[PDB]
Amino acid sequence: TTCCYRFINKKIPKQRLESYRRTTSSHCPREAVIFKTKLDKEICADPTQKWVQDFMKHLD
Amino acid sequence: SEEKANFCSTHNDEVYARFRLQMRVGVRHSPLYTPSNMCMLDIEDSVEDIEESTEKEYASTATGEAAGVNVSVALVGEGVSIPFSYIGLGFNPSLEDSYLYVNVSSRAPWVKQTSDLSANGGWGIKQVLEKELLAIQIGCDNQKFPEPADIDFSLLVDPRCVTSVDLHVELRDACIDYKQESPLSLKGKYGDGELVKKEIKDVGKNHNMCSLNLNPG
C-alpha cells in the first residue's frame, strides 16, 4: 500500500475522476484519500479539505 | 547557447513554459531482489476532454523504472500542453540501499515552439496558475516483500522500497534568464530541493545513467 507525503492545494476536475481509496495507518503516517482517474493516475488530496469529503460522497 | 539566445532575443514579448523536475529517491531493496542494470523509461502525452467546457485536458507523463523502483510523473493542463521532452535516471544496480536520481524536462520552444502562454492577456497563465495539476508517484515495480507560485503537486509513494524523497520542481518562463521577471515562475520543493538540484547535476561518477530524449520535430 502507498502513502502520501504531499497534497494538492487545488481541487481536482470532477469530470476526469473515477475511483477512491483510504490509507493504512500503521504504514502511512498521514491518513489521506487517494483519487484515481480516467487517466489512471492517483492524485491525492490530504482531507480536512471538504472539497474532498464531498467528492467522496459523490463517489459513494 | 547558439539558438536559445537568438531565439529569446527574437521573442522578447511573450512567455513559453519550461517545466523542470529534479528528484532524489532513497531506495531500499527487497531481500529477494536481484541486482540489475535494466532501465525502462517512457513518455506519453494525451488529450482528454473537459465535457463541461470546450477546452481540452492535456497531459504529459514521464515514467522510468530502475533498481526495483518505478516512478511516474504526470502533468495535467486544462487548455495547455507542456510536453515532456525528456527523462533521465541515475541509479545503482546493487542490493545496497542507495539513491535514484530522476530528471524530467519539457520541450524547448526553440526546439519546437510550445504555446506562447501570454497571448490574450495571459490566458494561458490563467490556465496554469489556476488549473495545472502535477502528480508524482513512486512504487516498487514487481519486487515482492516478506509480509501560490507554490506549484501544486501530489506525491504518493510505496514506503516499502522508498526510504526518502527529495525534490525540486519548477514551471517557469523558458527565457527567465533573459528577462527581469515573468508571470510564469512557479516553483516547488520537498525536502532539500536546492541540494538535490546541486547533486543531480553530477551523480554520473557513481551510477548507471539512462535517459530518454524525444525526437525534435
Ligand SMILES: *[C@@H]1O[C@H](CO)[C@@H](O[C@@H]2O[C@H](CO)[C@@H](O[C@@H]3O[C@H](CO)[C@@H](O)[C@H](O)[C@@H]3O)[C@H](O)[C@H]2NC(C)=O)[C@H](O)[C@H]1NC(C)=O
Ligand atoms: C539531470 O540534468 C542535469 C542538468 O542537465 C545533468 O547535469 C549534467 O551532468 C553531467 C554528469 O552527470 C555533467 O557532465 C560533466 O561536466 C563537467 C563540467 O565541469 C565535466 O568536467 C565532467 O567530466 C562531466 O562531463 C554536466 O556538466 C551536467 N550538465 C550541466 C548542464 O550541468 C545531470 O546529469 C542529469 N541527471 C541525470 C540524468 O541523472
Ligand SMILES: *[C@@H]1O[C@H](CO)[C@@H](O[C@@H]2O[C@H](CO)[C@@H](O)[C@H](O)[C@H]2NC(C)=O)[C@H](O)[C@H]1NC(C)=O
Ligand atoms: C510500478 O509497477 C507496478 C507493476 O507494474 C504497477 O502496478 C500495476 O498496477 C496496475 C493498476 O493499473 C495493476 O493492475 C497491477 O497491480 C500492476 N501491474 C502488474 C502486476 O503487472 C504500478 O502502477 C507501478 N507504479 C508506478 C508509480 O509506476
